[PDB]
């Protein structure tokens, strides 16, 4: 009860079952951005 609201928001959000989706999406964003850089490199080499 004397917990700050954010803790209960996290608790109910977990109760909804929406944690794994969140974690995997944020993890995937970094890797995809790195692929974006790679694609830039690819286009450079193609022009050469």
């Amino acid at each position: 009860a004397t917990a700050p609201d954010s803790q209960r928001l996290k608790l109910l959000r977990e109760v909804a079952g929406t944690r794994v989706y969140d974690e995997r999406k944020e993890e995937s964003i970094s890797l995809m951005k790195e692929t974006e850089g790679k694609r830039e490199k690819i286009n450079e080499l193609l022009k050469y």
Binding site: K41, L45, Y48
Partner: peptide, 21 residues
């Protein structure tokens, strides 16, 4: 990644030449 690797390999390939002088 595989495509990038293949492109880099290709670019290393094409740089050969044979000028017998």
């Amino acid at each position: 990644k595989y495509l990038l690797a293949d492109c880099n390999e290709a670019f290393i390939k094409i740089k050969m030449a044979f000028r017998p002088g």
